[PDB]
């Protein structure tokens, strides 16, 4: 099956040019005419074609992004890049590679990436347990989850034991704070009884500032003081 | 460039329903006109290209007709996994361009949130900082009222939420508000509970923790 992925910096500085390259694998980039492309999707708006290069090299380009937009076509890496230059906010988005093939239009997309332009720098996130215990339980089930505060930009991405974990894990869409910076929370519901013999370790990973993070999940120990059983 | 009319913006329907979202261009583009679907966090999915043939894969309870000007997309049977929103492109004359989008939300019964209250770690209190997470899990509708109260005085302006999207099975929604404080002013208090009001719940709903 033919794939694409997407990769590049996410996060670029105003009036500075956006570096992104889409590699095509378990396919050729040579097939007469296929149309590769680029999409982008600012959040909470709709989606805005940015133009597209094919076999021979010529493009046609959105035109209020013309004399910004540039893509090229690396046949022997099997490759599509694009780049935008003299970049301001109302680029922040993320950005799609998709071909448009034979019939109709855009049959395979990529995994999108998100490009956030700051002039601030990225900031790598805090995970924080979410423990579990007697008043995060309510009947049969009990709720513990991971914290991922204070980090920028977008996004990051969270799973409880390496991806082993997916029935009942709910991990919500970042906020900005009052104060600058992203943050969420991923949640898992789990039965009462696994408590203290079942691991749970979320798995927090923010590519923007190169840092993951693994945090094991306990019941919360208490210590105003109890009595202890050897 | 050629201007994409989509409507409705929003609309919510129940489980088995007939679904119907229209279309319109500003001129003719005769059966050049694709469909595509978007769930949340995800990139968009090809339904219907020319403007009724169904892509492989895509089941056949979607359909869209249309020709020249108008166009129509309808699902004959709405499912839960069918929740997200639905875009409609011109594949006629550059440049390319995409509809307004129509989100496509779930009617189901009522389904009352169970409340969970997340005391801040103690790794977070050595940063000088304080975070109580409170956790609705599982309800319809997705209106929720979320109100902190700390040592029986309500709390404003200190807190966010964020709530997830239609569960593809049962169709349900799942709240976090995050109240955060400095760590002083979380020492400085006993008390911290938190309200929460929905149609599920024959009276407000409170839960409560007090060592801070």
């Known amino acids: 099956q033919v794939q694409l992925q997407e990769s590049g910096p996410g996060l670029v500085k105003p009036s500075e040019t956006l570096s992104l390259t889409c590699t095509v694998s378990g396919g050729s980039v040579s097939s007469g005419s296929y149309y590769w492309s680029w999409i982008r999707q600012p959040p909470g708006k709709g989606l805005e074609w940015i133009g597209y290069i094919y076999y021979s090299g010529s493009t046609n380009y959105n035109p209020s992004l013309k004399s910004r937009v540039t893509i090229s076509v690396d046949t022997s890496k099997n490759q599509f890049s694009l780049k935008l230059s003299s970049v301001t906010a109302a680029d922040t988005a993320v950005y799609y590679c998709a071909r448009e093939g034979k019939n109709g239009a855009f049959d395979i997309w990529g995994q999108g990436t998100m490009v956030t332009v700051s002039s601030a720098s990225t900031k790598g996130p805090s995970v924080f347990p979410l423990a579990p215990s007697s008043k995060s339980t309510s009947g049969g089930t009990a709720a513990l989850g991971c914290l991922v505060k204070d980090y920028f930009p977008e996004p990051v991405t969270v799973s409880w034991n390496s991806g082993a974990l997916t029935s009942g894990v709910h991990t919500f869409p970042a906020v900005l704070q009052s104060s600058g910076l992203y943050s969420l929370s991923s949640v898992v519901t789990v039965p009462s009884s696994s408590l203290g013999t079942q691991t749970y370790i979320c798995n927090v990973n923010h590519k923007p500032s190169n840092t993951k993070v693994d945090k094991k999940v306990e019941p919360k120990s208490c210590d105003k003081t109890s009595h202890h059983h050897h | 460039d050629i201007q994409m009319t989509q409507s409705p913006s929003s609309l919510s329907a129940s489980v088995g329903d007939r679904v119907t979202i229209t279309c319109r261009a500003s001129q003719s583009i005769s059966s050049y006109l694709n469909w595509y679907q978007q769930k949340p966090g995800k990139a968009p999915k090809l339904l219907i290209y020319?403007?009724?043939s169904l892509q492989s894969g895509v089941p056949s309870r979607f359909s869209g007709s249309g020709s020249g000007t108008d166009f129509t997309l309808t699902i004959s049977s709405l499912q839960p996994e069918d929740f997200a929103t639905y875009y409609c492109q011109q594949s006629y004359s550059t440049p390319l361009t995409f509809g307004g989008g129509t989100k496509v939300e779930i009617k189901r019964t009522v389904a009352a949130p169970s409340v969970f209250i997340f005391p801040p770690s103690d790794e977070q209190l050595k940063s000088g900082t304080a975070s109580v997470v409170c956790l609705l899990n599982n309800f319809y509708p997705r209106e929720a009222k979320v109100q902190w109260k700390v040592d029986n005085a309500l709390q404003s302006g200190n807190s966010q939420e964020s709530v997830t999207e239609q569960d593809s099975k049962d169709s349900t929604y799942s709240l976090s508000s995050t109240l955060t404080l400095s760590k002083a002013d979380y020492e400085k208090h006993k008390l911290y509970a938190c309200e929460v009001t929905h149609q599920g719940l024959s009276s407000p709903v409170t839960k409560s923790f007090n060592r801070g």
């Open positions: 020319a403007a009724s």
